[PDB]
Amino acid sequence: SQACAKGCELCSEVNGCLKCSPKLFILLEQVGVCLPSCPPGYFDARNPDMNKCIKCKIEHCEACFSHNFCTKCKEGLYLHKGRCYPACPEGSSAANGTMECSS
C-alpha cells in the first residue's frame, strides 16, 4: 500500500500486517500484527524466512519455550520440567514460596 509506516515492513489493511521488520514476530486472529516476544500463551519461534510465533500444546501455560516445553506455568499450577500439573507428581516433591517442582 501507500504510507503505512508503523513497525512493519509491508502493511496492508487488506488482512493486516505482513513481513515484519527484522527481527520481530507476527500475530494472528484480526488479522495479523507485528511485535517482539509474542504474548501469553504464545511462544516466540524463529526461522530464516518466517518469524511465526506459535501457541504451545502444553495445558494452561503462560510462557512457552517450545511446543512441549513450558517455562512459566499458569497461576494455579506446578511446573515439573516442561509440563504443568495441578499436583506435583512423585516422582519428586514440591517446593514452596513459589510454584516449582524440585527433585
Binding site: 524463529r46 519455550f65 517450545s66 517455562t71
Partner: protein
C-alpha cells in the same frame, strides 16, 4: 509512584516500552518488580542504573540497539529472575555483566549478533533454566561456558553457523530436556556429542548439513521428540533407535533416503507420529513389526509399490495416514484401522477400490485418490463411512463414479475422468 513516560500498572510490574526513551526513568519506584524496558533507543547501559532498583524479578532489555554493557551495570542485584537481552547489537556475551545473578532462571541473548562467547561466561548462574542463543553468529558450541549450568533444562543454539559438534560437548548438562540445534551448517556430529544429557526428551537437528545418521542419540535414554530434517542423510540403519524406546515423535522428512534398516522401526511401541517425505530411492515399506500404536504415519515421495497385507491388523490406533506420491500399484484391507480419519493416497498407481477396502471406517473424513490409475470401484462401498466429507477422485480412468453412502459430502472432486488423454 509513576515515572512519566513509563506506564505504571498493576502492582509490581512497570512498562516503559513503545515508546520510547534513552537511558532509565526518572522516578525510582523502589518497591517495584517486573520492569519492561524493551523497545527503545538505548545506546549503552551505565553502572548503577539498576542499583537503584532492588527486589526486581524480571527485566526486559529486548528491542533496544545496545552495543555494550558495563560489567557492574546490573549491580549484582541478587533477586533478578529472568533477563531478556534479545534483538540488540551486542557483539559478545556480556559475561562480566552477568556475574552475580544467582536468581536468574532464564536468559534471552537471541537476535543479537554474537560471535565470541568468553570461557568465563554464565559463571554463577547455576539457577539458570532456559537459555536463548539464536540468530547469532556463533561458529562453535560454547562448551566450557555451557558447563557452568547444572540446572539448565532448556537450551537453544539454533539459527547459527555451528558446523560441528565435538564429543562430550554437552557432557556437564545433566538436567537438559530440550536442545535446539536447528538451522546451522552442521555436517559431522561426534559419536559422544550427546553424552551427558540423560534428561533430554527433545532433540532438534532439523535444517542442517548432516551426511550420516546421528548415532550420537544412542546416549539419549529419555528421548521423546526427535527430528533431523532437510539434512543429507542417505541412510537409516538397523537398531537406530534401539536405545530410545521412549520416542513418541520422529521427523526425518526431506532426506535423500536410500536404504532403510529392517530392524530400525521395529519394537518402538511408544511411537505416535512418524514423518517421512522425499525419500526417492526407498523400495520397501518399512518393517513396523513391534510398533503397534501410531496416531499418524507419513510416507511420501518413495518408490514403494505395495503395502503389507498385515499392516492394519496391528495399527488400530491410527488416525492419519498419508501415503501420497508413491509407486503403490494396488490396495489392501483398511478395516482394523478403524480409528482412521484422514487418508491420502494421491499420486499413486492404484487402479481399483473394493467393497471391503474401506469396509468399516466410521471415522474416515478426508479421502484422497486423485492422480491415480483408478477405473472401476468394486461393489461400490463408500456406504459404510458416515463421516466421509471430502472426497477426491480427480484424474483417473473412471467412466462412472459409484454413488452410495455419499450423504453429507461437502466436497467432491470429479475432474479429469476419464482421461484419455491416453
Amino acid at each position: 509512584p509513576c515515572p512519566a513516560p513509563c506506564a505504571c500498572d498493576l502492582d509490581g510490574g512497570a512498562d516503559c516500552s513503545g515508546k520510547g526513551l534513552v537511558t532509565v526513568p526518572d522516578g525510582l519506584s523502589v518497591f517495584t518488580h517486573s520492569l519492561d524496558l524493551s523497545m527503545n533507543n538505548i545506546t549503552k547501559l551505565p553502572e548503577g542504573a539498576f542499583k537503584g532498583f532492588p527486589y526486581l524479578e524480571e527485566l526486559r532489555l529486548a528491542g533496544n540497539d545496545l552495543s555494550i554493557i558495563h560489567p557492574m551495570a546490573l549491580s549484582g542485584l541478587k533477586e533478578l529472575k529472568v533477563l531478556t537481552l534479545q534483538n540488540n547489537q551486542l557483539k559478545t556475551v556480556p559475561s562480566e555483566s552477568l556475574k552475580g545473578l544467582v536468581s536468574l532462571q532464564s536468559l534471552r541473548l537471541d537476535a543479537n549478533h554474537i560471535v565470541t562467547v568468553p570461557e568465563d561466561s554464565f559463571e554463577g548462574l547455576v539457577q539458570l533454566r532456559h537459555l536463548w542463543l539464536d540468530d547469532n553468529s556463533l561458529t562453535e558450541v560454547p562448551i566450557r561456558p555451557l558447563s557452568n549450568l547444572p540446572s539448565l533444562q532448556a537450551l537453544t543454539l539454533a539459527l547459527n553457523k555451528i558446523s560441528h559438534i565435538p564429543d562430550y560437548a554437552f557432557s556437564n548438562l545433566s538436567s537438559l530436556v530440550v536442545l535446539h540445534l536447528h538451522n546451522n551448517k552442521i555436517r559431522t556430529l561426534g559419536p559422544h556429542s550427546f553424552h551427558g544429557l540423560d534428561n533430554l526428551e527433545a532433540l532438534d537437528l532439523n535444517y542442517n548439513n548432516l551426511i550420516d545418521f546421528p548415532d550420537s542419540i544412542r546416549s539419549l535414554p529419555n528421548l521423546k521428540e526427535l527430528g533431523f530434517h532437510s539434512n543429507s542423510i542417505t541412510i537409516i540403519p538397523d537398531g537406530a533407535f534401539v536405545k530410545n524406546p521412549l520416542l513418541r515423535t520422529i521427523h526425518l522428512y526431506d532426506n535423500p533416503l536410500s536404504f532403510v534398516g529392517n530392524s530400525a522401526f521395529q519394537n518402538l511401541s511408544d511411537l505416535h507420529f512418524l514423518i517421512i517425505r522425499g525419500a526417492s530411492n526407498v523400495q520397501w515399506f518399512p518393517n513396523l513389526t513391534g510398533t503397534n500404536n501410531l496416531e499418524s504415519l507419513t510416507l511420501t515421495g518413495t518408490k514403494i509399490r505395495s503395502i503389507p497385507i498385515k499392516f492394519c491388523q496391528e495399527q488400530k490406533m491410527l488416525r492419519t495416514l498419508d501415503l501420497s506420491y508413491n509407486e503403490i500399484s494396488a490396495l489392501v484391507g483398511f478395516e482394523g484401522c478403524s480409528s482412521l480419519e484422514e487418508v491420502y493416497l494421491q499420486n499413486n498407481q492404484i487402479q481399483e477400490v473394493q467393497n471391503e477396502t474401506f469396509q468399516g471406517l466410521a471415522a474416515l473424513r478426508m479421502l484422497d485418490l486423485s492422480r491415480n490409475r483408478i477405473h472401476t470401484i468394486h461393489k461400490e462401498a463408500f456406504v459404510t463411512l458416515k463421516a466421509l466429507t471430502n472426497l477426491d477422485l480427480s484424474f483417473n480412468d473412471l467412466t462412472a463414479f459409484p454413488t452410495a453412502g455419499l450423504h453429507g459430502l461437502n466436497q467432491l472432486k470429479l475432474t479429469g475422468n476419464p482421461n484419455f488423454k491416453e
